[PDB]
Every structure is written in structure tokens, then in C-alpha cells.
Design a binder for this molecule. Structure first.
Ligand code: CA
Length: 223
């Protein structure tokens, strides 16, 4: 997260870290056994880390649970990043408490202009590299479909939205990938892609979760 703030320990209790020996992506807990992340975050041997603030210190509220199964969207296209969404099932149910909680799925898609909360342990610099140990947060508005398509001509599908600040300075970034965009208490986006981070006229692009709620529910009902 570039141009964000320290969230505060466990105030984003649905935020997970995916770990394969190191943090490599975010995710969102949607019930005690299931995490939503980005398909471009797929790898084998994922451990889900719940209840994290400082990802490099055991602070006492963590739950580490290995993935039992990953399910990349059937229509995920790694070339265009269309359908950039994946489900991860946990080997055991998380213990839900004040610091480890699920985030609601949307029933209807989010309004343009809605201020949303994006979070993660990704890079905090535009130009250069610095990865934080504690969870960072950013409040960012959903941009219009027209400004999104103008920013990335030919590349925006109906399964994507832009959020952020056209002037630059505030954005998600590498390492935030797969993490949540929460609007009005619902998981509306997944951190997916963008040209650089926090650059003028190059906002963040997010998976539009509301297009996926039928597939999420049918998948969780069968696995
Ligand atoms: Ca920790």
C-alpha cells in the first residue's frame, strides 16, 4: 500500500497473509473454512495466516492453517487477468473471534464513488521498494468505468473496476495482490493489477467480486 496508514492490530480481522515460506499475497476470510484471493496468487504449498499484524513477529493472536485445496476460477485468463479470483479451502476451520472474522460477500455491486478500504503488506513506495511488517490500509474511491477504460484502453473487462487517485500518490501495490477491497461492509474487490503503483493516470485495477458470488456459493457448497 502506497500512501496509506497503519491499520492498527487486528482491526481488519478478515485480512489474511498467504505464506509459502514468506508472505507473497493477501486474501480475505469469507467463512471459517474458506479464503478468497487472486488467481494470479496461485501457488502450491500455501499456509494461510490469520490474525496477523506484524507478519515477522508472533504477537499471540495468529492462526496458521495449511490450505487443503486451491480452486482457480474456471475461466481465469493469466494473460489478460480476466476472472482473477481463486478460492482456498483450509485444512481445519478457523476459530472465529474478535481478531479473526469473516467478511460478507456482496449482494449487489458497489457504487462508483464509494470510499472503500484496501489493505495489505505490499510495497509502500512508488519508485523504490520497502515492504512493511505491519498491516497497512488505504481508503480509496471506486472510479467510473469510463475513466477506468480510458486509463487502460482495450484491457478493462466487465469483471474489473478501477479504484484510487488519478493524480498519483495512493495505491495498492505488489505484495497486496489477492487482498480485500471492502465497501459498505462487503468484499467488493480483490487486488489484481495496475501499471506500476501510485502513478499518475494509472489507477489500481480490482477483480469485481459481485460478478462471482454464484460461483463462490456453488463452489463452497460442493467442496
Ligand atoms: Ca505475527
Amino acid at each position: 500500500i502506497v500512501g496509506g496508514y497503519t491499520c492498527g492490530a487486528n482491526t481488519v480481522p478478515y485480512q489474511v497473509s498467504l505464506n509459502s515460506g514468506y508472505h507473497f499475497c493477501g486474501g480475505s476470510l469469507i467463512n471459517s473454512q474458506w479464503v478468497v484471493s487472486a488467481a494470479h496468487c496461485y501457488k502450491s504449498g500455501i499456509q494461510v495466516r490469520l490474525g496477523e499484524d506484524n507478519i515477522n513477529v508472533v504477537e499471540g493472536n495468529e492462526q496458521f492453517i495449511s490450505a487443503s485445496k486451491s480452486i482457480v476460477h474456471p475461466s481465469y485468463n493469466s494473460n489478460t487477468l480476466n476472472n482473477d479470483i481463486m478460492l482456498i479451502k483450509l485444512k481445519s476451520a478457523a476459530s472465529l473471534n474478535s481478531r479473526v472474522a469473516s467478511i460478507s460477500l456482496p449482494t449487489s455491486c458497489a457504487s462508483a464513488g464509494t470510499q472503500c478500504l484496501i489493505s495489505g503488506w505490499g510495497n509502500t513506495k512508488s519508485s523504490g521498494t520497502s515492504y512493511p511488517d505491519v498491516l497497512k490500509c488505504l481508503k480509496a474511491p471506486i472510479l467510473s468505468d469510463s475513466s477506468c477504460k480510458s486509463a487502460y484502453p482495450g484491457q478493462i473487462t466487465s469483471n474489473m473496476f478501477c479504484a484510487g487517485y488519478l493524480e498519483g500518490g495512493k495505491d495498492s501495490c505488489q505484495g497486496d495482490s489477492g487482498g480485500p477491497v471492502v465497501c459498505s461492509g462487503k468484499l467488493q474487490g480483490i487486488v489484481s493489477w495496475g501499471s506500476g503503483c501510485a502513478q499518475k493516470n494509472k489507477p489500481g485495477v480490482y477483480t469485481k467480486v459481485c460478478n462471482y458470488v454464484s460461483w463462490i456459493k456453488q463452489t463452497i457448497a460442493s467442496n
